[PDB]
C-alpha cells in the first residue's frame, strides 16, 4: 500500500483481502508477517559515545578550565618545542582531572540509560485488534500486528501501526500526534479520502500514526505500515530534544556556580594585586613583565585549584545513580533532573480510580425499583459473587439463587449494561485469566450481564473464549446501535441510540453515569415494566441507598442506569459539540443501579503513613462520588476512621463557591477532592503551586493527563493510560505505589550528596586560598608554586570528590519534613562551617611551612622576625648571620605544605560523608568508592614524591617519617574539629561504630607521642 490516504476504505480493505467485521485469518496472519516481520524498531543508540562525552564540557567551570588550560599551553611556550616533561606538565594536570570527571559522568549515565531501556521491556505493549480465530476484539502484542488486520484504538490508547481509519464508533476522533507532526493541539480524524498524494503528515486526516495518542473518541482501521515502513520509524534518527522545566535545583546550582565563578574571578585578582610589589625582585627574572607573567601564572593555578569543576559531574552521576536505583525498583524516570523534584515535594496529589485503588472492579451490588405507591416505595436488592472478571458468578436477591425470569427490570438492567458498553472481555491463554478491553467499569458491567444471563443461554460447550462475551452478544443481536453519544466528564454520563433490527419507530436511548446526575434527568421510573412518574421519596431513598453503598463496608462506586423511550430522530439531533449531549440525555426513566467494589492497592495504605511521616500531605483528586472518596481516604489512611472530613474533604462545586479566604484554607487544609473535572483536577494543582508548593501528581487516566503536566513531577501508572503515560515524567512499571517514598528518599538523598560535595569543595579550596593569603600577610615565602597548586587541585577536588556522589542515605533522611525551595542553597551556618573549616586547613598549611624553618631539627633555626623579613636576609645585614637566602627557598617547606593540604584535604574528604553524623556514627568504608579514592589519591601523592624524576618537576623533595608524623599531627584536628562542628549542629541546632574506634584510636596515641611548638610569634 503505497498511498493509502488517496484510496477508498474499499480499495485499502480489498488490497489486503479483509473484512473489518471479521478480520485477518490466522494463515494471512503468518504470511504477511513473513513478508513483513515484526512491528517493532531496531534498538538505536541513544546517544552518541562522542555526544555524551562532548555534552560535559558544557558547563561554565568545565570551559573555564579548558580555557585555563588552553592559556598555560600557551604560556609554556618560552621555547618551540624543546621540552615534553618539565614544561607541559601544567596543562596536563588541568585536563586529567576534566578527563576523569568526564569519564565518571559518561559511564554513569550510559549506566542510567542502559538500565531505563532494559527496564522498558518490562511490560510487552499491546494492542486490540479483529481476526478471524476468535468472534470478538482480542489483545494481541503490538509486535504482533501485520498490515492488513483490523485494529480498534479505543481512546486513551497508544496507536501501535500506522493505520487507515475505516470507521469511527463515537461522534469524533481527536488523536494527539504531537510527537510526530509536533502541533500541541488535538487533530480532528475522518474516514474519507484525501486526493492529494504528496499530502504532509498534517493532511492525512484519514490515517492514525503509530506512536499517537487518541485523546478522544473510538474507531477502528485497517493496519497499512507496521515497523519501520511506518512515518514514526522512517524519521526515528531524526528527533529535536526538549528539556522539561529546568528543575528549580538547577537553577540554585546555576547561580551558585556563577556567584562562585565571580568570586572566585575576584580573589585572583587579589592575588595578582597584592602581589604587584616584588615584580621587578631578580628571583623572578630581574624585570616587572617578568614577575607580572608568573604571578599571573599564580593567579590562574588558583582559580584551577578554587573552581569547583567536578560539581556537573558530580550532579550527573547522582542524577544517573537515583536512575538507576529506581529503574532497579520498576521506575521509568525519562529525564534524570526529575529524580530530585519528588525529594523537595511536600503534596502529592493522586488519582483515587486506577491509582490507589486497583482498578480491578466487579458490580458487587445493584437494586432495581420494586414498586412505588405516592410517598411509599419498595426496592429489590441484589447481591453479585466473584471479585474478578471471570465471569462465573451467581446474582442473589436475599442469599438465595434468583429464579430463571421472576425480576422484569433485570432483563432492561442487563440490556442497559451491555448495550451502553464500549469495553469488551479477553481470555488470555498464556495466563489464563479474563482481562479488559477497554475501562474497567465497562468490563464490570460486560461481566455482570455475563453472570446475570437474563435470556437463559446455554453455557455448557462453550470455550474460556467464547464465555467471554456470549450474553453480551445475546442481548446486542436483538437490538442494532445506532450510534453512541460517548462518555463526556462535564456531563458524567454516556448514551447510545438503540433500534429494533426489523424497520417497524420503536428506537430508545440507554443512558448510564454517575447517579445523582442521571437521577436528577430522571423524570420516570421503571416498576417492572410499567412506567411510573418519579416522585421526590424516591429520588431520595436511592441517594440514601447509593450513599450506604459508597459509605459502607466495600465503599462501592456507584453507577446509575436509565432509558429515554422516545428519543429524537437522528436527523434532529446535533452531535457537533458534547456540551449538546446532555440536551437529549433528559426525561429520562430510571431502571437501576449497580455498585461495583474496587480494591484500594495494598501497598498504598502503608505508603500514604510514611509520606506524613515525611511531612508530605496527600490528597485524593478524583471524579468520582464523595460518599466513596471520603471512604477510600479512611481506607487508606488519608482520614481517621472517625474523623470529622467536614472541612477537609471537598466537590468541584463546593471548592468553586467558596471565598478566597475559605479557598486558601481548603488547598492547605482540604485532603480529599471529589466530582472534580480535568480542568478541575488541573486547577487544584494551580491552586496549590500558588500557595508555593511543590507538588508531584499521580494519574492512571486522561482526566489526569492535564494535571499532570501542570505538577513539578507527573508519576503515571504502568497500567494506565499512554496519555497520562506521556504526560508524566515517571512511570511505575509495576504500579508500586511504595515506590513513590523510595523516589522521596532518592531525591533527598541526592540533595544530602550535592551538599556534601559542596562542603567538601568549598572548605577545603578556601583554606587552599587562605594558605595563600596568610603567607602574603605574615610575610613568609611562598609556600605554593602553581604547579604544585594544580597537583593539589587533581589530587583533592577529583575523585575523592566525584565519589561523595555514592555517599549512603542518612538514617533519619524520611523523618524530616521536606526542604522549603524558597531558602537559600546555603545556610549561615553552613557558611560558618566552611569558614571554620578552611580558616583552619590554611593556618594549618602555613604552619607546616614555617614549622621547618622555625622548629625543624633537620631544617634551620630561624626565628619568627628573621622569617617574615627573608627579602632583608643579606651577609651585609647585621641581623642576618648563620642562615642566607638559599634556605628560604629551599623545596623542603613547600613539599610540607603541599603534603599537609593534600593529607587535610583527604581528612576532610572523611567529614563529608553526612552532614551531621559523626565518623563514629557512619564510618569511612559506608561509602567504599571514598575510601578507594583517598587511597589512590595518597597513593598519587606518594609517587610524586619519591619516583626517581618526579620530585624535580614538582620542586619538592622525598619527606622522611619524622616529617610526615608532623604532617599528621598537623592534619588530623580537622577531623575532630568537624566532629565539634557537627555535635553542635546536632544538639544546640536540631550506637557509635565499635570496630572503628578501636581501628583509629590506636593511630591516634601513636602519632601523638612528643610535642613541638614554634618560637614568638609575634603577629600570629
Ligand atoms: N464509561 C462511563 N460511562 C458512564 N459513566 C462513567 C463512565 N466512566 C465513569 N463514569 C462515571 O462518571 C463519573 C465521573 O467521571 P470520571 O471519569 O472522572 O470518573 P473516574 O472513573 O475517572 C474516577 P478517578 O478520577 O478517580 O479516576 C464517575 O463517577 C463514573 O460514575
Ligand atoms: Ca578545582
Ligand atoms: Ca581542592
Ligand atoms: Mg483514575
Known amino acids: 500500500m503505497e498511498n493509502a490516504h488517496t484510496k477508498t476504505v474499499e480499495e485499502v480493505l480489498g488490497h ?45 567551570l568545565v570551559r573555564i578550565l579548558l580555557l585555563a588550560a588552553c592559556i598555560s599551553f600557551v604560556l609554556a611556550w618560552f621555547e618551540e618545542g624543546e621540552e615534553t616533561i618539565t614544561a607541559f606538565v601544567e596543562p596536563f594536570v588541568i585536563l586529567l582531572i576534566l578527563v576523569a570527571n568526564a569519564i565518571v559522568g559518561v559511564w554513569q549515565e550510559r549506566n542510567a540509560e542502559n538500565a531505563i531501556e532494559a527496564l522498558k521491556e518490562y511490560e510487552p505493549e499491546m494492542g486490540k485488534v479483529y481476526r478471524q480465530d476468535r468472534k470478538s476484539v482480542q489483545r494481541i502484542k503490538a509486535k504482533d500486528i501485520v498490515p492488513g488486520d483490523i485494529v480498534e484504538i479505543a481512546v486513551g490508547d497508544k496507536v501501535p501501526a500506522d493505520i487507515r481509519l475505516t470507521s469511527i464508533k463515537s461522534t469524533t476522533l481527536r488523536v494527539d500526534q504531537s510527537i510526530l507532526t509536533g502541533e500541541s493541539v488535538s487533530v480532528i480524524k475522518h474516514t474519507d479520502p484525501v486526493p492529494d498524494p504528496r499530502a504532509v503528515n498534517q493532511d492525512k486526516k484519514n490515517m492514525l500514526f503509530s506512536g499517537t495518542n487518541i485523546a478522544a473518541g473510538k474507531a477502528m482501521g485497517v493496519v497499512v505500515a507496521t515497523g519501520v515502513n511506518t512515518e514514526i520509524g522512517k524519521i526515528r534518527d531524526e528527533m529535536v530534544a526538549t528539556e522539561q522545566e529546568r528543575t528549580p535545583l538547577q537553577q540554585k546550582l546555576d547561580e551558585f556556580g ?36 608568573y604571578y599571573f601564572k599564580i593567579a590562574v593555578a588558583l582559580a584551577v585549584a578554587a573552581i569547583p569543576e567536578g560539581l556537573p559531574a558530580v550532579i550527573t552521576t547522582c542524577l544517573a545513580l537515583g536512575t538507576r536505583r529506581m529503574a532497579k525498583k520498576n521506575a521509568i524516570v525519562r529525564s534524570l533532573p526529575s529524580v530530585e523534584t519528588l525529594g523537595c515535594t511536600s503534596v502529592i496529589c493522586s488519582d483515587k480510580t486506577g491509582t490507589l485503588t486497583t482498578n480491578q472492579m466487579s458490580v458487587c451490588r445493584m437494586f432495581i425499583l420494586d414498586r412505588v405507591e405516592g410517598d411509599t416505595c419498595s426496592l429489590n436488592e ?16 436475599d442469599d438465595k439463587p434468583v429464579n430463571c425470569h421472576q425480576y422484569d427490570g433485570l432483563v432492561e438492567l442487563a440490556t442497559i449494561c451491555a448495550l451502553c458498553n464500549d469495553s469488551a472481555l479477553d481470555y488470555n491463554e498464556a495466563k489464563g485469566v479474563y482481562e479488559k478491553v477497554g475501562e474497567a467499569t465497562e468490563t464490570a458491567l460486560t461481566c455482570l450481564v455475563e453472570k446475570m444471563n437474563v435470556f437463559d443461554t446455554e453455557l455448557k460447550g462453550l470455550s474460556k473464549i467464547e464465555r467471554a462475551n456470549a450474553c453480551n452478544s445475546v442481548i446486542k443481536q436483538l437490538m442494532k446501535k445506532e450510534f453512541t453519544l460517548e462518555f463526556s ?25 454517575a447517579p445523582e446526575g442521571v437521577i436528577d434527568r430522571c423524570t420516570h421510573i421503571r416498576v417492572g415494566s410499567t412506567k411510573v412518574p418519579m416522585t421526590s421519596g424516591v429520588k431520595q431513598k436511592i441517594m440514601s441507598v447509593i450513599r450506604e453503598w459508597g459509605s459502607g463496608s466495600d465503599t462501592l462506586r456507584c453507577l446509575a442506569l436509565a432509558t429515554h423511550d422516545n428519543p429524537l430522530r437522528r436527523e434532529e439531533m446535533h452531535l457537533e459539540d458534547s456540551a449538546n449531549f446532555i440536551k437529549y440525555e433528559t426525561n ?90 480535568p480542568s478541575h483536577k488541573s486547577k487544584i494543582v494551580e491552586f496549590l503551586q500558588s500557595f508555593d508548593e511543590i507538588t508531584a501528581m499521580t494519574g492512571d487516566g486522561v482526566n489526569d493527563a492535564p494535571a499532570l503536566k501542570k505538577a513539578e513531577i507527573g508519576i503515571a501508572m504502568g497500567s494506565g493510560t499512554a496519555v497520562a503515560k506521556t504526560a508524566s515524567e515517571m512511570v ?51 609556600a605554593l608554586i602553581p604547579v604544585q597548586l594544580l597537583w593539589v587541585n587533581l589530587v583533592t577536588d577529583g575523585l575523592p570528590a566525584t565519589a561523595l556522589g555514592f555517599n ?63 627579602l632583608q636576609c643579606k651577609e651585609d645585614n647585621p641581623d642576618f648571620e648563620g642562615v642566607d637566602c638559599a634556605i628560604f627557598e629551599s623545596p623542603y617547606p613547600m613539599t610540607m605544605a603541599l603534603s599537609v593540604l593534600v593529607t587535610i584535604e583527604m581528612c576532610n574528604a572523611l567529614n563529608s560523608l553526612s552532614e551531621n553524623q559523626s565518623l563514629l556514627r557512619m564510618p569511612p568504608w559506608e561509602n567504599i568508592w571514598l575510601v578507594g579514592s583517598i587511597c589512590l589519591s595518597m597513593s598519587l601523592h606518594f609517587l610524586i614524591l619519591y619516583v626517581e624524576p ?40 536540631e550506637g557509635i561504630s565499635w570496630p572503628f574506634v578501636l581501628l583509629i584510636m590506636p593511630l591516634v596515641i601513636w602519632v601523638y607521642s612528643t610535642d613541638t611548638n614554634f618560637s614568638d610569634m609575634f603577629w600570629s
Open 16 to 60: 489486503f483481502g479483509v473484512n473489518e467485521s471479521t478480520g485477518l485469518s490466522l494463515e494471512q496472519v503468518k504470511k504477511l508477517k513473513e513478508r513483513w516481520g515484526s512491528n517493532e524498531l531496531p534498538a538505536e543508540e541513544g546517544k552518541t559515545l562522542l555526544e555524551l562525552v562532548i555534552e560535559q564540557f558544557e558547563d561554565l
Open 258 to 293: 556563577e556567584q562562585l565563578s565571580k568570586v572566585i574571578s575576584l580573589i585572583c585578582i587579589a592575588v595578582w594585586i597584592i602581589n604587584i610589589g616584588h615584580f621587578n625582585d631578580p628571583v623572578h627574572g630581574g624585570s616587572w613583565i617578568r614577575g607580572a607573567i
Open 808 to 870: 549512603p542515605p542518612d538514617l533519619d533522611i524520611m523523618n524530616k519534613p521536606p526542604r522549603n525551595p524558597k531558602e537559600p542553597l546555603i545556610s549561615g551556618w553552613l557558611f560558618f562551617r566552611y569558614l571554620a573549616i578552611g580558616c583552619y586547613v590554611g593556618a594549618a598549611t602555613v604552619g607546616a611551612a614555617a614549622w621547618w624553618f622555625i622548629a625543624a631539627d633537620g631544617g634551620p633555626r630561624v626565628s619568627f622576625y628573621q622569617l617574615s623579613h627573608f
Open 950 to 989: 618526579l620530585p624535580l618537576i614538582f620542586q619538592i623533595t622525598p619527606l622522611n617519617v619524622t616529617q610526615w608524623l608532623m604532617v599528621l599531627k598537623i592534619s588530623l584536628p580537622v577531623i575532630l574539629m568537624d566532629e565539634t562542628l557537627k555535635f553542635v549542629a546536632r544538639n544546640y541546632l
Open 489 to 513: 466528564r462535564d456531563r458524567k454520563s454516556m448514551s447510545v441510540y438503540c433500534t429494533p433490527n426489523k424497520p417497524s419507530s420503536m428506537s430508545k436511548m440507554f443512558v448510564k453515569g
Open 732 to 782: 511505575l512499571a509495576d504500579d508500586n505505589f511504595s515506590t513513590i517514598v523510595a523516589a522521596v528518599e532518592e531525591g533527598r538523598a541526592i540533595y544530602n550528596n550535592m551538599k556534601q560535595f559542596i562542603r567538601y569543595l568549598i572548605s577545603s579550596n578556601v583554606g587552599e586560598v587562605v594558605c595563600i593569603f596568610l603567607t602574603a600577610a605574615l610575610g613568609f615565602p611562598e
Open 588 to 677: 429520562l426513566t430510571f431502571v437501576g443501579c449497580v455498585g461495583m467494589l474496587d480494591p484500594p492497592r495494598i501497598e498504598v495504605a502503608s505508603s500514604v503513613k510514611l509520606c506524613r511521616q515525611a511531612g508530605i500531605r496527600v490528597i485524593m483528586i478524583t471524579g468520582d462520588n464523595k460518599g466513596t472518596a471520603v471512604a477510600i481516604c479512611r481506607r487508606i489512611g488519608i482520614f481517621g476512621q472517625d474523623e470529622d472530613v467536614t472541612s477537609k474533604a471537598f466537590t468541584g462545586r463546593e471548592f468553586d463557591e467558596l471565598n478566597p479566604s475559605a479557598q486558601r484554607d481548603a488547598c492547605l487544609n482540604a485532603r480529599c477532592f471529589a466530582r472534580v473535572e
Open 382 to 397: 441484589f447481591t453479585i459473587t466473584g471479585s474478578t472478571y471471570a465471569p462465573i458468578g451467581e446474582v442473589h436477591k
